[PDB]
């Protein structure tokens, strides 16, 4: 529904019918995400990884008791055409969830 990323790909998201929103800074993306969650949690929120590594961490206090507005990070267009550490992201997620490093 709602996407936070660079303004260039926000045009494509709007072209898809999604509520693409433009941002270019970590603090600016944090402010935009706070604005989105404050004005209603109905929209699903795709945040860009470079702008925000852990989207739920930034608005963790405001997201207390919130279930519908799920937040996840996305790589972005500049990083899309480059090698993506899918193993690193999964290892970090497993470490956060279970408190261990078990990737072997």
């Amino acid at each position: 529904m709602a996407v936070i990323a660079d303004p260039e790909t926000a045009q494509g998201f709007r072209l898809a019918g999604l509520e693409g929103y433009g941002a270019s800074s970590a603090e600016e993306a944090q402010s935009l995400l706070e604005t989105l969650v404050e004005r209603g949690g109905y929209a699903l929120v795709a945040v860009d990884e470079a702008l925000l590594p852990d989207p739920e961490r930034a608005v963790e206090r405001l997201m207390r008791g919130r279930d519908l507005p799920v937040l996840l990070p996305i790589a972005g267009l500049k990083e899309a055409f480059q090698g993506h550490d899918v193993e690193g992201y999964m290892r970090e997620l497993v470490r956060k969830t279970i408190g261990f490093d078990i990737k072997l």
Partner: protein, 165 residues
């Protein structure tokens, strides 16, 4: 408690019950971690699929940005109806209720603007595939988060029983 033989027998029974409960909770944690190991591989595969869809969608988008002017795609995005009413059903996972996003339709692909150049049209479908993979990734990540919370709770309870009571 009052020191008496009956109280002593009651305490010994309580100790036996605590040990049996510890064993049962450890078995439950074993089942949970098996499910977690399955979900980790599922999430990794979904993330790889999303990455591939992202690559192809961005390649499609950038191609139309140079062959056609940005004003054309801007007008097309202004003319397309927005997306609304994405299904948000709930799912039961080990008792706790987890949301499950379900993109029923990207408005059904029912409306398009009057100006539809060849390069622009393919870009929108790429973004639709992008979104329908992103929803799957989000659902899987929510499932792993719930299972991880359950595992952490069980481990905390087991530690409390083994080291306090």
């Amino acid at each position: 408690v009052s020191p008496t033989r009956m109280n002593l027998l009651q305490r010994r029974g309580q100790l036996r019950l605590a040990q049996k409960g510890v064993d049962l909770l450890k078995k439950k944690r074993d089942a949970l971690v098996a499910e977690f190991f399955g979900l980790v591989r599922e999430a990794m595969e979904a993330r790889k699929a999303l990455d591939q869809a992202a690559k192809e969608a961005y390649a499609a988008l950038l191609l139309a940005q140079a062959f056609d002017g940005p004003e054309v795609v801007a007008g097309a995005a202004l003319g397309v109806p927005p997306l609304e009413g994405v299904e948000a059903e709930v799912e039961n996972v080990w008792g706790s209720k987890v949301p499950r996003l379900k993109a029923t339709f990207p408005d059904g692909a029912l409306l398009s603007p009057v100006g539809t150049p060849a390069y622009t049209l393919e870009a929108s479908r790429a973004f639709r595939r992008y979104a329908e993979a992103l929803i799957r990734v989000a659902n899987t990540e929510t499932r792993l988060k719930k299972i991880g919370e359950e595992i952490k709770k069980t481990t905390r309870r087991v530690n409390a029983l083994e080291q306090v009571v």
